[PDB]
Structures are given as C-alpha cells and as structure tokens.
Design a protein around this ligand. Structure first.
Ligand SMILES: N=C(N)N[C@@H](C(=O)NCC(=O)N1CCC(c2cc(-c3cccc(Cl)c3Cl)n[nH]2)CC1)C1CCCCC1
Length: 121
C-alpha cells in the first residue's frame, strides 16, 4: 500500500526529470525565450495533499512544452499519478508565493518535493 504510493512517486519523479533533461538539449533562441515564462510556486509543499499545487500548473507546463517541441501524453501521465497521490477526500486550498519561477526552477521544486516524500516512507 505504501509501496504503491512509493512506486507512483517514483514514476512522478522520473517524469519530471525527463522534462528537465529535455530542456537542456534546446538551442539558444529557444531556451532564453522559454525561461521568460513564469510559474506559480507553492507556499507549502511537504505532504501528498499539496500535489494539488502541481496539478494547478500542469496547463502552463504543457503550454510551454508545446511551444518548445509528445508533450500531451507526458503531462497526461503526470496528471494521472497526481490524481492518485493527492487523495480524494477534500480539495486542498493552494497558496502560491509572490515570487514566480522559470520552468527550470518550477521542475526543480517538484523534483525536490517527490524525493522528500519518498524519503519519509
Ligand atoms: N498560469 C500561470 N502560471 N500564470 C503566468 C502566465 O500567465 N504566464 C505567462 C507568461 O509567463 N508569459 C506569456 C507568454 C510568453 C511566451 C513565451 C513564448 C515562447 C515562444 C517560443 C518558444 C518558447 Cl519555449 C516559448 Cl515559452 N511564447 N509566449 C512568456 C511569458 C503568470 C503568473 C503570475 C505573473 C504573470 C504570469
């Protein structure tokens, strides 16, 4: 049961890392223009329920990946995982920081998130 969550988290981590690795391969008029896109960062992200704050920024993530290229299926998969992991009991009320982030900073935040949860179970 916890292993099921652990494996789901492992796929999530890997999916985010794939996107991040796919970002370094780009040119220079692509990378610079891509980094101007601003993402919302969660004020608090320490437990599984906070993955709502990932779901709520998948649309801009998919948007930015489409303008940089399938991205539809990778983000689709992240959604499926996130929906499973976030729990279906109550909707978590997401709070975001005043300082926005690049796509790199955004990914690095959620990569650090997954690794932190995996460590605690
Ligand atoms: N849904 C959001 N995360 N909201 C942000 C949002 O609406 N994003 C917009 C944004 O960051 N833009 C608008 C589109 C701009 C753009 C960049 C590109 C582009 C063009 C060629 C290649 C590539 Cl990869 C890209 Cl990303 N096309 N258009 C970049 C900056 C706002 C957050 C709060 C402050 C204001 C932004």
């Amino acid at each position: 049961s916890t292993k099921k969550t652990q494996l789901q988290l492992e796929h999530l981590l890997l999916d985010l890392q794939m996107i991040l690795n796919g970002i370094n391969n780009y040119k220079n008029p692509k990378l610079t223009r891509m980094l101007t896109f601003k993402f919302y960062m969660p004020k608090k992200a320490t437990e599984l329920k906070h993955l709502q704050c990932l779901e709520e920024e998948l649309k801009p993530l998919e948007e930015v990946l489409n303008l940089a290229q399938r991205p539809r299926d990778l983000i689709s998969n992240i959604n499926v995982i996130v929906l499973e992991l976030k729990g279906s009991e109550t909707t978590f009320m997401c709070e975001y920081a005043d300082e926005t982030a690049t796509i790199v900073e955004f990914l690095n935040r959620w990569i650090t998130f997954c690794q932190s949860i995996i460590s605690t179970l």
